[PDB]
């Protein structure tokens, strides 16, 4: 129970590692393997080593702290073995931080200033061809940054416990890829990008629709629209160092304008359209009794989980097309109906927290009379990217509001990109077209936070009802193989692929790890979205005015007719087969 670190004397029963206990009392250890509670087992990266008397130099990551250690950690020893590690790992990186997309905020930087590293011979290869894999629709390979830290192999088994991203033999070399070096896309993979989030360089990104983007905008017949999801809004002013949980939704609309797009709309728009549909369908299935349950359809991450490892289920899901395509739909067909376009003139872009939702705009089927739902979806780091590329000073400016025909939103579409926001949406909405009331009572606090599956008992017309809420595309395997899927009848169930919502989208923000221990990113950065449902006016997606009018005037009742046709999307299992 009693330590000596640096000379310093500690008295502790804690049972915990070298490195969290030092970091407790606020002992700089650096680190980089070491991310979500694991280092990198089988190539440590040693970045952490400290001394023990006695025993030599040892992995503070990983060993626990005992009674009568005497360590040291800024001996001789200690920073050259530690300056050693990160000039073998300079060896092999391609050290040229001015072009990259980490510049900014890339831990292997911080490391090789901290410790006046340099390669033994720099690496600069001739065709980073061979390195690079830009085949997915929505994750990129980039190996000649890549540091072999296993980060992304351990978040990706932690978080959706797919093992998709894998230690690969390759030339008879360690790389990191997808199985058999397949394209991500071809594979069991999510495409949900906790893998790029989990990296400490530039050697995982999003797959790039700056330039698709930047083309439709520079085109002159080309119209525009650009729409942000729910979670862009409370996050991206992270990226200006404006700190963390700052609702910046009046700044983003200013920018955009500056950026020259046409329109500006909100996909939170998108979000209430999913519920008219969806809570519509739920309503539906309580008056049919079945077919029980129905999951959201709105996470493509959740989706290709369905596709790959559930393929029973998706005639479970609900047909309603996601926010994200919704919108999209009505922007190619309801938005030219009101403006004038010609529907082929129409580039509609979203902004979104996810790499997946660039697979899911992609997706062949997506698309009627020739005409994309969505053309180009960039994340938070890329509209991020295209601002500052601008010079545009988005801390300094002003609020403006979006253009409110597909801009305005309710309450209950703006907590959507919160783990429960959906299911929290769908339930207001369900309730009062079951009941043909207008309730007062609207909050369902028992379906949020941080907990990996959440259940409630719902009662809908005089009877109770079961909901699901499954935080993670790890809790979606969990519920299912446990057998919790059947110890109760579910009626409606929520999926996010990605813990704490979209909020901790694979499109989003880096954090600092230590910085990440400093404040809790997923609760943060929801803050902003229920918050802006406590001041709104509007909290059920039915009472959004601008998509009521939508409604009455072109598409008709949801959930029939026009709206079914439209609207929705149904994903079909593959008939049996042999072999
Ligand atoms: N389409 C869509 Fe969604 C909405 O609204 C986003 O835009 Fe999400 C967020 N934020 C993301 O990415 S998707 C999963 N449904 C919940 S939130
Ligand atoms: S990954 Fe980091 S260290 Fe490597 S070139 Fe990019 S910014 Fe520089
Ligand atoms: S995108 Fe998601 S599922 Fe695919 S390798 Fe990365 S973490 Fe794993
Ligand atoms: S891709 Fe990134 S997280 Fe994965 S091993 Fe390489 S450097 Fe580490
Ligand atoms: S939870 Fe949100 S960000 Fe994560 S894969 Fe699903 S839609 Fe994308
Ligand atoms: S951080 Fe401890 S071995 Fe990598
Ligand atoms: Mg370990
Ligand atoms: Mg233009």
Redesign the pocket.
Known sequence: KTIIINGVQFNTDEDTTILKFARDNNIDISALCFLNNCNNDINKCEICTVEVEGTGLVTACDTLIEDGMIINTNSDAVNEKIKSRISQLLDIHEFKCGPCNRRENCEFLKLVIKYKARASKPFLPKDKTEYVDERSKSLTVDRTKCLLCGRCVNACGKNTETYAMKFLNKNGKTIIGAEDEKCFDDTNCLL?GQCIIACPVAALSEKSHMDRVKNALNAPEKHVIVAMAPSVRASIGELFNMGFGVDVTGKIYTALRQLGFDKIFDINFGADMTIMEEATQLVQRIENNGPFPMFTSC????VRQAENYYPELLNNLSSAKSPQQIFGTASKTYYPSISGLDPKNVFTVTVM??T??KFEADRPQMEKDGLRDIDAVITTRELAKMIKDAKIPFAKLEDSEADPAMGEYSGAGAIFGATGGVMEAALRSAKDFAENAELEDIEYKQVRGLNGIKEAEVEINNNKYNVAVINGASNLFKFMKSGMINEKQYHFIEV???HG??VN??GQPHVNPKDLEKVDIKKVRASVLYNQDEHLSKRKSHENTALVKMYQNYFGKPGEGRAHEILHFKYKKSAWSHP
């Open positions: 949900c996470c493509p991450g959740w927290p996810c997946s939702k996010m692929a990605c919502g979209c989208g694979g």
